[PDB]
Symmetry: C2
Subunit: 326 residues, 2 copies
Amino acid sequence: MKVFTEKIPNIPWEERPEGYTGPVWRYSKNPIIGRNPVPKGARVFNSAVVPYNGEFVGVFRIDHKNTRPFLHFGRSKDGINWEIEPEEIQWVDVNGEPFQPSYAYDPRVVKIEDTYYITFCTDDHGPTIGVGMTKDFKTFVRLPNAYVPFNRNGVLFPRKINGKYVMLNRPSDNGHTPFGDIFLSESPDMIHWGNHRFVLGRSSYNWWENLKIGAGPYPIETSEGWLLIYHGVTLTCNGYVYSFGAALLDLDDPSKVLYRSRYYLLTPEEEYETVGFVPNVVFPCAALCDADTGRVAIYYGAADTHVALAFGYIDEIVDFVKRNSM
Amino acid sequence: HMKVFTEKIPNIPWEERPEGYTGPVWRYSKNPIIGRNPVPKGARVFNSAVVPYNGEFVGVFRIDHKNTRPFLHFGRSKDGINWEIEPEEIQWVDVNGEPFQPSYAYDPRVVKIEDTYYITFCTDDHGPTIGVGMTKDFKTFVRLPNAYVPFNRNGVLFPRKINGKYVMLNRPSDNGHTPFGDIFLSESPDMIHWGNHRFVLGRSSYNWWENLKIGAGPYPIETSEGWLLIYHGVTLTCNGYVYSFGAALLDLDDPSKVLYRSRYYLLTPEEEYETVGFVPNVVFPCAALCDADTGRVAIYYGAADTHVALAFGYIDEIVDFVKRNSM
């Protein structure tokens, strides 16, 4: 199988536990960061990480000590030990005027051609998908929001498809949405979005994802299709439980689902996932894949309190998705 | 004084105001004009997106069938009051001529832009959203891709491009009986891809009639005083919603800028055909005709989700009312 990502020789990595049978396993030293990450910060738990300049950089959601979310930039030599800026990213518009979001969270980072695009959730009389970019992680330029509210889990495909930018999104409500399907939209210019298509919806049969789902890491291009890692939610009598799984989408028409695992890849089990600000959440934010070895590192938010890592091999994950497909 | 940029409509449906009547808008004394069991398969007709066509009037009508499912039907009228409605729903094809039929469709609006009549409506795509269609002759109806992902309704286009862009009013919503709602606008170069969204108008805190949600009604009418937007406003009582309608004026060049907005509704449910029916206490404006020659306005509205009714007024008096009663 072929994977169309970067060579990442120094990807964060840990071998699977002896005799471990699952496609994806936790970093034994999780969580890697979480409470009181910076002087103004209460919890860090989203981490849109990419390789950059032989190292790693990320855009992090940090809830400050008023519980309001901000996006901070961070750097890491190894992807495990992070230096995060104490202050939030400052955004300007294409004209260079300040264009600062009221609040911002749920960051995703993906390189398309020569530019890193950053999506995030922000207010515009309700949650919607904000869109920004940077070529150097120094100057952050914010574009007009992609949608009117209410929308979240916006993430871009890592290249144009048929000459169009393609945005996964997740139509929502004003509150703690009790539903949600993944759609995609296309744009000629990163501003005007159209030709929307339903991609993937909540399952009736698989209880882990029968309440709502939403895209996580940007879709990874393989010869087997776009590998989409997505979270799925179920509602118990005591609240939501967020897990994550994966699907494979047709390369030419990503709204066509080829395979989708009936079982999650990961669900809350460890203390740092089952206890915290929002208990019982594993929320995948970014995935690195070393094209040379097939090694995959997934960054996920745990309990809305910590950043954690999980590892696997891309071909095993793809196999898991196909074999557990309905 | 004031200019209105619409067609001359000498035969507009019209009735003079009752003697000594003081309000800007009055109901047609012979309301409702159509409603219950309009066609063999039909239970109630109560949206009517009406435009002048060919010296007469045509419309796209929402008819709930006798399974209470909504469909859009084409209708014709010589005078705009007496309607002949097709017994079967409009059939839609895509730009390739392949069938592209909505699962269900309601809330139609019809607006001519240049040489083409655009029709927006509410349809399903895993939730309510704004569907978009077009016709040059009202014989062939071509449907474009929906303008938005769910959940959205009250989509209505501006009757011309503004700064080279098509502009769509819309109303971000819920999956259910939405307990909020602001009017936004979006722009498009091509009627397919939409961006540069902006909040236009939201629910009022002070005016209780519109404190729950609002939504665009008839397409915005271009006047020298701005875009006249007739919009519905909702309040929640302990026994349900009450829909009224009022009006705002939007800046001609940047319609997201509100110049004036009437604190009072133009119309609220008061008559039996408005306060009794499938959904009691609803007046829901769908279409406005304005005769550029005289300034006469005829507003088609749904009454209690049961009937089509008419209200009349003069555009200058309506505009005057909006300005005078602006917060």
